[PDB]
Every structure is written in structure tokens, then in C-alpha cells.
Subunit: 625 residues, 3 copies
């Protein structure tokens, strides 16, 4: 013979933590139901020995855990699902429960030397026949749970909603104890009649109580009992074969809960071992019994990414940076040529032999200057810098996608933001110094034959491709409209011959006109622009030559100020940013991937179920002795 | 040629301090009534020298005090303390925030200020009616304010003075806005044929921090020589704020000294009565609240010391065993009296195993049922209540029987002291109890002793049962309910319930009777006749108690009786001056005591003052 | 050559500080307009590179100044039109713009090494034209119009392009910008840009400022992301966008280029406007204030000195007996009223002409008649009278000195001075008041009066009647000015037993006093000559006795109140003036309208000179 309800309540509360399980339901609890004003709060406060229950309607279920604490002469409260502990003032507790109703069971624990080791549930706002109410009656009123029906006595037992719902939840009254309140408001003759009832008979009988009337609130319950005890000692003979007073209920609940919880110990062990055996298989199959620490997972996957960036570092600083850059400046040259040269009516004049010393010989010399300045004073500093920045940021996205981090968005953003944070710190340093080192190209260059030659081959290839893009777009209209139907629209808009159709036709004219321009220029580049300082009024070659000088000088200052510094500092910064993440964030970050969430959640269950079972089995082995 | 107004005002002030007296009302005060939005505020603010009325950003009991070397102008609110308001902006707020028959007692102190007492009744006059009688009818001087722009022949503020004083002495007239009206019509206003007053009439004008003291000097300079520039247009007249003030000063001097003779009379009349009441009801015995509280607490402290002696011993042992007696009965009902085989326990010799086993098992469950019941907790709480109960008895026997606030402080500090030791006592008791949780020992000395107890315990139980049983016979019928009893045995309102109770009481009395016979003759030998539950349970109850009562005195009692006086004393010192008066005034006779002696002291102070002034004023 | 937009926008901001000019008007700014939900706030935020516009109702326009601050990677915002500078948190910028909408333009400036040098005016949403009193004003003068139009909407139905023709027929100062190019076919997009209904010289720009998918706004990420997608679409659809201007990059490039051309061309006419505006303001300054500068603080102090001068010049002269006379005026009026309050209403006043009395009771009745009269003037309460008289004398005279100075138009200063003066005088109130009643102790009786004092006494008492009963009778002449019937001796009788019945009672009182003073006049002149022997004329015994107290009264008025005032008043004033803040002094000075004009005119000249030095210099360089 030994009382282990303290331990059994720990098991129930442990099992209450396993996500969606009928395991905790197998361990009974004393559920309290009673009409509003039937004295239900009064009988509860009597068990606790203090006031804390506020008396609006539908206060919402209160999962009350009474825990006996040695060396604690005072009464304390704890709302764990809010990390609130050792509340010595019960007025605060009373208003906390009021603040909460402004179905979710309030997790509140009471700890004191006076209090017995119990588990109770305060079911509030009743039903007098006339959905959410249906849910609580299934969740709390069923299972092995003991029902405490609070009857007021100054009410007929057929009229009480408490006993009516009790028979509905039962009947036969095997797991129902009926408490009869306001025993003082009825003659001891009828009081004994109500208790020894025969309409609503219960296995765990009836208890008759009187509960009316620390120092201000402790003495309150002492005064209340003095009166209750008085009435019962005086009317002793009137209450033959009767269970009466607060003391006898505390006594009853203690006896019944021990019987109830321990009888449910073998059923719960079977059910736990059952869920524990299913959950072990799932672990060994989906995740091959591998333990997963979230902060570890997080850090190890960052090491992989940090490795990926070292691999990118290896194959980038090179002519690859020249390529990304020159490709952008190639497009600027093409724009400089269209906005200046290509639209000019006398563009054919450059292909001619004769020249007029003053007016026309200087016209092209001036044109070539503001075309060159247009490109050199364009903004190479910001361009180069903001170009190579996107390049890194983009390759980072590729590295992130080629790793397990492809499933974690919150991590991916951390990496991306911290990457741009690193890059930004050197934006000005890079951009400004790049502009300063590209100034010698802003006003003519003393280029060698070698420089001029390389530029010429590139310019030919540039215009080759530019012309091939225009012809294809011209042929695109030629086929989509009709070879002949095209000439109809073109000649009409031109007015040399005769809505949606005219748009295609007008475009086709521009393209027809462009190709002619690019053709007489491409042909010239191949047949004429051979000399350096002499053939200088060959824009395509000169512009490409200055852009070659601009690119090779920019890529060197991009490395020194931006590239090198990023590769060193980014890992160091990334690590710093990770250590800033609290345990909470890290779990959420890792739980993004549903496979990893599934992983985290399954082991949390396994460990909790293992904890419950160990406690149960050690108790069972002892109980079998 | 002395102006003892400062003292006469002082006398009026302290006579207003007495709970219920018409002595202060005898002493005159310049009551002011004026036309609403005319300039009722402006006229008063001029007398003082600063702005304060909430009419610009209920009745104000204004008390002007002349103070030496106080070049600055300060304000007091004796009812709200503060006592020094330099900046008059917060005074303006104070009169507006307080305005959200009650007199606002405001005091103004400065060297510019003359010695005067005034009352500011708002605008024109169940509430309005009382203000008209309370301050105007009495021997208090009246002042009327209006506006020159509105009808001058029709003045409600002057009409109210005519209604309260038709063709009377104590009245002073005031006319404002003299800049808007010509000096001709204003000449007929002062020496009027319509409303003549023996005190006189005066004409003035009030238009347009010390920026507020400059504002009064601007408005005074505004029309200083205006009364000079047209001397004939105002000859045989009382003109300017300077002479108005001089008038209020000299009239009050006489008015207050006129009323000084009947007041000294009425004071003595109301003092001889109060000194008679003190002589008859209290016998001139003085009452200091703090002293009364401490002296009565000392009496209570002694009552606890006297009880400490008459407690513990067997007196504590008796209460504990009586509660254990009830548990033995409850254990016996739950494990014996509701069992058919109860006779088998005596009648014949038990079987070789099964029958001996069952009855030996039953006393083990019953013993554990008693020992593992929760004695520690039970014991502690029994004695805890015992102290609180006796504490109330000591309280009701004393002078504190009328003082609930104290009774609660006492009952609270006691439970706090007892609570301090609850765990240590209960736990200690549960330890000394454990060696009795599974032990079949003792001797015939305590067995024969517990046997005799078991007889008497079953006896009084049978008595109470028979009584209740035979009492239902009277309520229904000896042969009437007897037939109704048999009606429930074959089928196996009030009468069906009373019958079902009687069926139980019948067999129970027969159950206790056969058990009583057993205990008498059969139960005798110690450990041999062990299966005599009522005896074994009485033996264990006598041990449980004896051991418990020892640690109840060790842990709980000794510490209570030592520490409780110390903490009670500590808690009383934590009471404020306001608390002490409230705690003591709870008894109506004690409230009467203080109320009377407060009036007595104040009336003696007024008289000693008023008398000495009369000795001077006659010479 | 160089791009002096940064310097040109600095000039435009100065020209926005001159309270009455069309100077800033002649310098270009990019006025942005577009229908609600067309990407107007989205295009501005792409240039800025940070989210800053609130998304509340969009009330008053935003004067958006963009400063390219070197070494500042971090994008910071400042609200110059309030004391709020380098704001790092753009949430607070968003909510400040929102708070400022709870019709002047909102002065907001963005600083960064990323942000270009640009002037922009964010005009309210919808731009329907219908009301648009802001649009008419801002879309005119030399200003570039940026017409934000969404591609998903027909160009003919665009609110921005409509107003652009309504303000600029022929697109000579309008840049068309077509947003939402991602909600339109690239062939149709090229169609919108290569328009013919609304063709513009400045061009059309196709943009995509779509956010594709929380420190994302702290850095330039959200923005980088939005551009990366935009750059993708125009690289993929490069083939379709032939002879088109596409991307935010090209728009930012265009805005920078165009603004330079615009601002530099508009520079030359603006200098001509500033030069005239300065010449006009310099002229007024020469002709109104002979080109003399004004320092509000210096001005006030200098005028205070002139005021402090008057008090010193008033101190030396006004002491002697000039105050003693003002005290004699308000003390002889009490010798006048000692009789009226007592001695006058006596019927036995006549029998003293006979000079026959009884040694037992007749010689006792007239002795205590003068003991009550001698105490009715010595216990009168002159302390408060003399002190507050002199206090008010000093106070009135101070206002005179203030009108005598330029301080006549500044009331706040006039208050400050008078407040200080009364405070200084207050600190000596009781001290003086008590000293006037302390020195009057043996003078409360009559032993102090001699034969020599009686000389001026008998004569100044007949001279008392002289001036007073002539000026008081001059006002008795003021009644016969208005009118006439009267009748006229009969009114007095039927009263003795409407309007004129009131003067009948006035006349009956005057008749009594006119005879009562006269039989005294004919007697006291040739009756009482002796000092100790003759003691029955109160008029001669009190008119000089009050003035014998008056002589002893001005002495202690000087000792306590007067000496201290003249000493401590400049000291306390100088102290009280230091307390005044630079904001308070400007407000105190700006009380006079001529001074408030002076301050404004020289401030305008200063700003105008500042701006011109900058314009003229830029022009010299540009003309080379
Ligand atoms: N007379 C009497 N009143 C009681 C008793 N028990 C509870 N009450 C009163 O019943 C009233 C309302 O019930 P309450 O205690 O709030 O419990 P509820 O049923 O949760 O509302 C309170 O005012 C209690 O004092 C009792 O046993 N006797
Ligand atoms: N011109 C002039 N206005 C006065 C005079 N007396 C009072 N007032 C005006 O009366 C108005 C309101 O009266 P107030 O002084 O607030 O006293 P209230 O009657 O308590 O409201 C103010 O605007 C005053 O300026 C006066 O003698 N001359
Ligand atoms: N698809 C697409 N949406 C855009 C584009 N530009 C802006 N938006 C969206 O257009 C909506 C309203 O535009 P907003 O910038 O507020 O224009 P405003 O109302 O004229 O200031 C916003 O929800 C933007 O996300 C774009 O270029 N493409």
C-alpha cells in the first residue's frame, strides 16, 4: 500500500505534452461540472485553501494541477504555458484568469504544503438543453475521468443541469461523485434525503458540504470551515449513513484518484509501448534512426555553403569578370552608336575618299569625342561595382540551391542579406576608386597597333551579331505578315506606292533601314579601319578600344576593393549573424523543411513517450510487489 | 482705535471648526453676490491684487491675512494643505478642478492684503435656495455687484439684498463699468432715494506671478484721476477702491466687535453643555486613541498568557482524541458495520486460514485507514482553529468587542504566526506517527483503558441512533410507520423517506448492540483478543494523540505563545495616525468621546480668546 | 565638360528661401505625375533605391532633393523644413510623410553615394485635371514633366499624358515613362513606346518596377531583386525592343542627362532675374535704411541703454521736493476729508466765533474733538499710500521714457521693462511702508508743532481753500453748460417739505457747505494767530501738520524705496535681458513693422547675393 498520485500526475502532464495522443486521456482527472451559482467555485477554492476563481460566464476550461510542496507554508501559483512562476499574490492570479477570457484549457498549477496532490478541470458555462459546448462534453466528460457534479440543494435534483449531464456522460454513476452544496439552506431532514437519493444513484456516493461566509484569505476558509463543522457536529444524528464536509470531499477525491489513476496504469503502459513501437519504426525507416540536433544541422549546412563560395572564389576573379563587364559595355557602345552615328543622314560620307579641311573634317572629329565621353563619363564606377555585386549575389543563389538550404527560405534570406551587407560596406570604396583610375581614358588614348587590331576584330564581330539580330527580326515580320503583304504596308507608310498591321509594318521599315546602315558599316570595318591614329574616325573600333581599356582597369580595382574583401569577410560575418540567432529562431529556421520538421517532431515525441513509459513501468513493477 | 479683526477672523475660523454650531455664523463676513458675467470676479481680484477666479481660465470662503515682510502674494488651502502658492496660475486651476453648499476654504497672505473674511457665492444667488438663507440672513455684511450696460433700476443682485434685508443697516452697495455711463446718472446712483443704506454706497471701475500684480496697477491707474477730474460730478460721495477697502475695514471692525458680546454668550452656553456631557457620560476621563489601542491590546496579550497556562496538557489531548473518535467511528462504519459476517468475528472459532485471514486483513486496512488518514495536518489544524476560537473568546470578553478592525488585525496576525509553523509541526507529527502505521504491540494497561473507552464510544453512538430512530416514531407513528417500513422490503413521499431512514437506524442499532455485548464480555485479553476493532482502533488513537500533542506544543504552541505577542506589537506600530483614529472611533461611545473632547478644546480656545479681547474692549 | 547639377540644385534651394520670388520658378525641377496605381511611387522608389512613400491618402506635394553624398553607403533621409536630419530608419520616413498628411511642398532630401544629384517634385495621385491648382503651377514654367503611364492602359486614356499636352503642346519638356511592361506583349510594348498620338522630343521609357517576391528594405536587396527581374525581361525580349528606351537604369540615366541640359540652359535667364531682383532689393534697402545692417540683439540692448539713460536723468532732478508735492496733493485731500468725516456735521461749529467757553465741559468737548481728528490723520495709513504712490509715480514716468525712445512700438519689451521695475519696487514695499509708520511715533500727538511752523500753516490753509474751491467750483460751472429751464428755487422747497429732482438734493447740500466754509474763512484769517493759546482752527493745524509728516515721509521713501530702485533697476534689467533667447529676441525685435521689414529685406539681400555669387561663377566657367 503506497500513494503515487504525485508521480502519476507527472506522467499525465508528460503525456499531455505529446502532440495529438489519446495517451494522457487514459490517465484520469477530476472534471468539475456545476450550474452557475451552485457553489462550484466555492467547493474548488475549499480544496486549494485560497481564492483565485473570478465570478463572468464561460471562463474557459482550467486544467488545475494541485501539487503538494514540502517547506512551503505559503500558497503559490504557476501558469507554465506563459512562463509565469511562484505567484504569491492570489488577487493577481484571479485577474489573470479574468484577462484570459477577453476552448483553450488554462494550464495553472497550485503549489503548497497544505494542498493534496490532485488534477482537476473547471468546466464553466453550462447547457440547459438550449456545438462548442458539445466538444467539451466529449473531451472532458468521457474517458476514465472522474466526474464531480456540483448540486446546490436549494434546487430539485431533477432540475440540476449538473446531475442531468452526469447521467448523460455516464450513466449508472460508476465514475461520478455528486457534491451537494448549500446544505445549510435546507433542513437536515431533506439534506439527508438528497444525499441518500434513489432517483440518481452513484457508485462513488454523495458528499454534503457548506461553503459560505494568506491572513485575509487564509483565515477566510478557516472561518468558513468553523461554521461548516459546527452545523455538522450539531446535526450529527440527522446525518446517519452520510458523507459530509469539505474535509471528507478532499478525503474522497484523494482516495478515488489514487484508485482511478493506478487502475489506468497498465492500460496506459500498453498504449504507450504501442505508440512508442510505431514511432520507433517511422524513425528507423524515414530517417534511419539518425538523431538530428537543429543548431548542429544549421551550422553544418552553413559550412557546405561556405565551401561552395571558396569553390566560386577559385574560378571567378579572372577574365570571367572582364567578360561580364565587357558584355555590358558592348551594349553601351551599341547605344552610343545609335544615339550618335547610326541615325545620322551622312553616315555613308565616312566610307568616301574626299574631305573638307574646316567644316566637315572637324564634324566627325567632334562627333567621335562626345560619343567617347558619353561612354567614359557614363558611370563605370557604379556600373562595374553594381554589376559584379549582382554577379556574386546571383552565384550565391545558385550555391544555396545546390545545397540542403534550398528548403530553408529564412536561412536563404539571412545568407543573401548578410552577403549584400558585406558587399555594400565596400560599394563607395570600389566605385569611387574605379572612376578615379578610369579618368585617363576620358580624354583620348595613346593606343598601340596591337590594341587597335584586337578592337577591330571585336567591332566586326559586334556589328556582325548586331546585324544578324536585325535581319532575323526583319524576317520575323516578313514571315508573320507575308513576304508580299509586307511590301504593301511598307510602301504605303513610306508613300512611294499605295491598324495592328501598320505597327508591324512601321517596325519592319526601321529594321529594313537599320540593316542597310549596319551593312555599309560592317563592310567598311572589314575593308578599311586598319590604321591606329590615322583611321581614328572608325567609331566601332575606337569605342571598343576605349571600353577594352576601361574593362581591364576596372576588373583590377574590383578585385582589390570588392572581390578579395568579400571572400575574406563574408564567412566571418555570416558566422557572427548565425550566433545572434536564439534557440527559438534556429528551431523555426530548421523546421522550414517539412522533412526536417517531421524529423524534429518525431524524436521530441519518442523521448517524451520514453520518459512516460519508464516512469509507468518502474511504478508497475513496484505495484506488482 | 485698535483693529483686532485679524484675531476676530481667527475666532470665526476656529468656530467654523466645531462639528455642529451657529457660533461662526454669529461672527460677520462680507458675503458677495454679483451679476453673472458682469464683473463679479474682477471686483474681488482687485481687493486681493491677483487673478484666481475660474470665471477666466462652490462658494469660496476667502480669508485675507496681513503678513509682515511678505512682499509677495501667497495662497493656502488648509483643507488640502500646500500652504504656499506663489504662482496664481495653479490657483486658477485649483478653483476649476475643485468645481467638478460646500465652502472652498482659501486663504490669501500678503502685506498689501487687509484683514478681512469674505464668501464668494457664484453668479445670481433645492441648492440655490439654501445659499440665499445660510450666508445673507445672518449678521454677516452683504455686498452687491452688477453691470452699467444692463438695466440699473432692475438689479437682481441688489434685489436679493433688499429681499434678505428690507430697510436695514448691514449692507454695502457697489456699481461697476462707470467708464461706459456719464458722470451725471452715476451721481444719483450713490445718494439714491430708492435703496438707502446706513453703512453707505460706493462707485468704482475695473477694466483691461506679478505680471498679474501689474495688471491691477494698470487698471487702477486707468481711472485713478478720473474721480479727480470730475469732483463736483461726485461730491458728498464715497469714491475709488482705496476708500471702498477703508470702508470694508472699518465696518467689519465694528460688525465683528458688535457680535463679540452675543458670541461669547453663545460659546459659553454651548461650552457649559459640552462640559456637562463630559462630566456625566465620560466623567472628565481623557481619551488618547493610540493609548486606548495599546492599553486594550495589553489586556488581550495578558488573556493569551492566562490561556497558555490553562491549555496544552490533557486539554489539547481531549480535542484531538475527540476528532480521532469520529474517525474511528467512520472507519468502523466503512469497514465493519456494513458487513453481514460481523457476528462470525465472535460466535465460533475461525477457520485454519481463510476466515482468520479476512478478519486479520480488515483490522490492517482499518489501522492504515486511521494512521495514514493525515494526522499531522489534522492535528496542526485542530489546534490552529482551537487558538483562533479561544482568541475570539478573549476578544469578546474585552473592550475590543466593539472594534472589528482591531479584532481582524489580531485574528490575522495570529493566523500568520500559526502559519509560520504549519509545515514543521504537521511534518514532525507525521514522522512520530509512522512507527504506529504497521505495529501490533502495547500492553494490557492501555488495552483495558482503551477497552473501557470503546464501550462508552459505542454506547453514546447507540444512544444517538436510538434517539433519532425513536424520534421518527413520534413524527409518523409507532404502528403507523412500522407498516410503512415493511412496504420497502417486499418491493426490493415524506414517510417513504422517513421509513427508509428508519430501516437503516433499526439494523444499525442492532449492529451496535451486538458489538457492545461483545466488547463487554468477550473483549478482554490484550494482543490475544486483537480482533475487537473498536478496542485496537482506540488503542492506536490513544498513542497517535499522546505522540502528536507533544510535538504540537514543541513546534506550534510554544512558538505561538512566544512570537504572537511580538508580531502583534510590531503590526500595531505600522498603523498610521489616520488608521489609529479610525480603529478606535469604530465604537460609537469612543467616537462620541473624541468628538466631544475635540469640541471642548476648540470651544475653550475660542472663549479664552473672545473673553480677553472683551476685557480690553471695555477699557 | 563638367556636370554641375549638384551646385545648380543648391542655387534652386536658395531661390526657394526668398519669400516673394519667381526666381526658383525659372530653375528646372523634374515634376512627376501619373494616375493612381500606375507605378508613380514605384518609379521614384527605384531611383531613390529605398521604399519611402507611405502606402497615406497622398495630400500635399513632396519637394524631393537628391544629394550624392560621397562615403555614405547607408541611405539617409533629412527633412530640412524642420529640425530633423540624418534619419537611418525609412519606416519613420514613411510614417513621417504619412503623419505630415494629417498646401506647401514637403521638403525631403535623400543622401547617398548611390543616389544621383536630382530635383524632383512628387505631385499627388490620379492627375485627372477634372482642383489641380498644384498641377497647373508645377507643370508650367521651365520644368520637366515626367508622365508616368501604365502599359496595361490605353495611351489615349492616360491622365499623365493628357495633362502633358495640356501644359506642353508638342513634347518639348516632357519625358514619357511607360510602366508595367510585363503586363503587355513585347511587340505591343514597342508599339506604345514608338507612339504617334502623343510623340515626345525628350522620348519614351519602358520600365518594370515589379516586386517579384525582414531587413530587405534596410539594404538595397528588394530593389536589386526588382531590377534583376526587369533586366532579365529586356535581355530576353531584346529582339522586340528595337529603337526603344527600356529599364529604370535608362530612365535614371535620362533624368540625370536631361536635367543637366535643362538646368544649365535655364541658368543664363535666371542670373538676369537674380541680378535684377538683387538690384531691386538693394535699392529699397538703400532708400529705407541707408544700407545700415541690423543685429536684433544689439538693437534691443542699444535702445535699453537709451531707456536706462532716462532713469538716471530722472533720478537726479525728480528727488528734491517734486515728489513731496505729489504727496502733499494726496495728503491735503485728507485734511479736507478729516473735517467732512467728523468736524463738518457739527451744529455747535458756529458758537466758536463768539470766543466764550466754560472751563468745566465746553473746553473739554473741543479738546477731544481735535484728539480724534489728530489721530484720524496720523493713524490714517500713509505707509501703503506713500509707498504705492511713489511706486505708481515711477511706473507712469517709465512709460513716458519708453514712448520717448524707439521702444514705443515694441510692447513685449515695454512689458519686460515695467515688469522688472514693479518687481524691484515690490522688493522694498513693506520695508518702506513700515518705515513711514515707524517715524510717525512721537508725531501721533501734537507736541512737535512750533511757532515758526505755524507761519506757513495759517497762509497755506487759506491758499488750500483758494486753488481747491476754485477748480472744484470750475466743475460746478460744468453743470450750466448743457441746459436751462430749471425752476429754480422752487425744486429745493417742495423737496425740503424726474431728472432735475436729483440736482435739487445736490443744491441743498452745497448751500449749507458754501456758508459753513465762508464763516470759517472770514474768521480763521483774523482769529487764530497764537500757537499754544489759539487751538480751535483745525484747517491751519492740520494742512501743515500733514506736510510736517510729509517732509519726514519723503526722507524714508528715498532711504528705502527710491535709492535702491535707481541702483538695482538697471542691474536687474540687464540680468532679465540676458535670459532672453536668440529666438525670443528676434520675435521681440520684429514687433515694429519697420524693424520686421528691415530684418526681412537684409535677409533677402543676403540670400540673393549668396545665390548670385554661385550663379555668376558657374556662368563664367560655362562661358569657357
Ligand atoms: N449559504 C450558502 N451559500 C453558498 C454555499 N456555497 C456557495 N455559496 C454561495 O453561492 C454563491 C455563488 O456561487 P459561487 O460560490 O460563486 O460558485 P459558482 O457556482 O461557481 O458560481 C456565492 O455567493 C457563495 O457564497 C453554501 O454552502 N451555503
Ligand atoms: N469696460 C469694463 N469692463 C468690465 C468692467 N468690469 C468687468 N468688466 C468685464 O466683465 C467681463 C466678464 O466679467 P468677469 O470680470 O470675468 O467677472 P464674472 O462676472 O465673475 O464673470 C470681462 O470681459 C470684463 O472686462 C469694467 O469696470 N469696465
Ligand atoms: N506587374 C507590375 N506591377 C507594378 C509595376 N510597377 C508597379 N507595380 C504595381 O503597381 C501597384 C500600384 O502602383 P504604385 O506604385 O502605387 O503607383 P501610384 O499609385 O501611381 O503611386 C503596386 O502594387 C505595384 O506593385 C510593374 O512595372 N509591373
Amino acid at each position: 500500500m503506497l500513494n503515487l498520485t504525485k508521480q502519476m500526475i507527472e506522467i499525465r502532464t508528460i503525456l499531455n505534452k505529446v502532440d495529438s495522443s489519446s495517451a494522457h486521456l487514459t490517465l484520469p482527472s477530476i472534471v468539475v461540472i456545476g450550474s452557475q451559482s451552485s457553489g462550484k467555485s466555492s467547493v474548488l477554492e475549499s480544496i486549494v485553501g485560497r481564492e483565485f476563481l473570478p465570478k463572468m460566464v464561460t471562463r474557459r476550461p482550467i486544467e488545475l494541477t494541485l501539487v503538494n510542496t514540502p517547506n512551503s507554508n505559503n500558497v503559490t501559483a504557476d501558469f507554465p504555458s506563459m512562463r509565469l512562476y511562484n505567484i504569491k499574490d492570489f488577487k493577481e492570479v484571479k485577474r489573470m484568469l479574468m484577462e484570459l477570457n477577453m476552448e483553450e484549457p488554462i494550464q495553472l498549477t497550485i503549489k503548497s504544503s497544505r494542498v493534496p496532490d490532485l488534477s482537476l478541470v473547471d468546466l464553466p458555462g453550462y447547457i440547459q438543453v438550449e456545438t462548442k459546448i458539445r466538444d467539451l462534453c466529449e473531451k472532458y466528460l468521457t474517458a476514465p475521468n472522474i466526474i464531480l457534479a456540483i448540486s446546490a440543494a436549494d434546487v430539485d435534483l431533477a432540475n440540476s443541469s449538473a446531475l442531468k449531464a452526469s447521467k448523460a456522460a455516464d450513466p449508472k454513476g460508476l465514475r461520478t461523485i455528486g457534491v451537494i452544496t448549500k446544505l445549510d439552506l435546507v433542513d437536515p431532514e431533506k439534506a439527508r434525503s438528497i444525499l441518500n437519493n434513489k432517483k440518481y444513484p452513484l457508485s462513488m456516493g454523495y458528499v454534503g458540504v457548506i461553503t459560505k461566509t494568506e491572513n485575509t484569505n487564509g483565515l477566510k476558509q478557516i472561518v468558513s470551515h468553523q461554521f461548516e463543522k459546527a452545523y455538522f457536529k450539531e446535526n450529527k444524528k440527522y446525518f446517519t449513513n452520510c458523507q459530509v464536509s469539505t474535509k471528507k470531499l478532499r478525503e474522497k477525491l484523494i482516495k478515488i484518484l489514487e484508485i482511478s489513476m493506478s487502475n489506468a496504469l497498465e492500460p496506459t503502459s500498453t498504449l504507450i509501448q504501442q505508440e512508442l513501437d510505431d514511432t520507433s519504426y517511422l524513425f528507423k525507416v524515414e530517417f534511419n534512426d539518425r538523431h538530428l540536433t537543429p543548431k548542429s544541422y544549421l551550422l553544418n549546412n552553413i559550412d557546405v555553403l561556405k565551401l561552395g563560395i571558396k569553390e566560386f572564389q577559385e574560378k571567378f576573379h579572372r577574365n570571367e569578370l572582364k567578360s561580364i563587364l565587357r558584355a555590358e559595355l558592348d551594349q553601351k557602345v551599341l547605344d552610343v552608336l545609335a544615339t550618335r552615328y547610326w541615325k545620322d543622314d551622312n553616315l555613308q560620307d565616312l566610307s568616301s575618299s574626299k574631305l573638307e579641311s574646316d567644316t566637315d573634317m572637324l564634324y566627325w572629329h567632334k562627333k567621335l569625342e562626345l560619343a567617347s565621353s558619353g561612354l567614359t563619363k557614363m558611370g563605370i564606377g557604379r556600373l562595374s561595382t553594381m554589376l559584379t555585386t549582382n554577379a556574386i549575389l546571383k552565384e550565391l543563389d545558385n550555391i544555396l540551391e545546390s545545397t540542403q538550404l534550398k528548403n530553408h527560405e529564412l536561412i536563404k534570406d539571412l545568407v543573401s542579406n548578410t552577403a549584400i551587407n558585406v558587399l555594400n560596406s565596400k560599394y563607395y570604396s570600389t566605385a569611387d576608386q574605379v572612376e578615379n583610375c578610369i579618368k585617363p581614358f576620358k580624354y583620348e588614348i595613346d593606343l598601340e597597333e596591337r590594341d587597335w587590331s584586337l578592337a577591330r576584330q571585336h567591332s566586326i564581330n559586334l556589328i556582325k551579331e548586331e546585324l544578324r539580330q536585325c535581319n532575323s527580326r526583319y524576317q520575323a515580320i516578313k514571315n508573320a505578315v507575308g513576304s508580299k503583304k509586307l511590301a504593301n504596308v511598307m510602301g504605303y507608310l513610306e508613300n512611294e506606292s499605295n491598324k495592328l498591321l501598320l505597327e508591324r509594318g512601321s517596325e519592319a521599315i526601321f529594321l529594313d533601314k537599320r540593316c542597310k546602315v549596319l551593312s555599309f558599316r560592317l563592310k567598311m570595318l572589314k575593308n578599311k579601319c586598319h590604321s591606329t591614329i590615322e583611321k581614328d574616325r572608325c567609331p566601332e573600333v575606337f569605342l571598343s578600344a576605349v571600353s577594352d581599356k576601361l574593362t581591364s582597369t576596372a576588373v583590377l580595382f574590383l578585385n582589390v576593393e570588392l572581390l578579395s574583401d568579400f571572400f575574406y569577410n563574408f564567412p566571418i560575418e555570416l558566422d557572427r549573424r548565425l550566433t545572434l540567432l536564439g534557440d527559438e529562431q534556429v528551431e523555426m529556421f530548421a523546421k522550414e523543411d517539412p522533412k526536417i520538421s517531421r524529423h524534429i517532431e518525431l524524436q521530441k515525441r519518442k523521448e517524451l513517450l520514453e520518459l512516460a513509459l519508464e516512469k509507468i513501468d518502474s511504478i508497475l513493477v513496484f505495484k506488482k510487489s
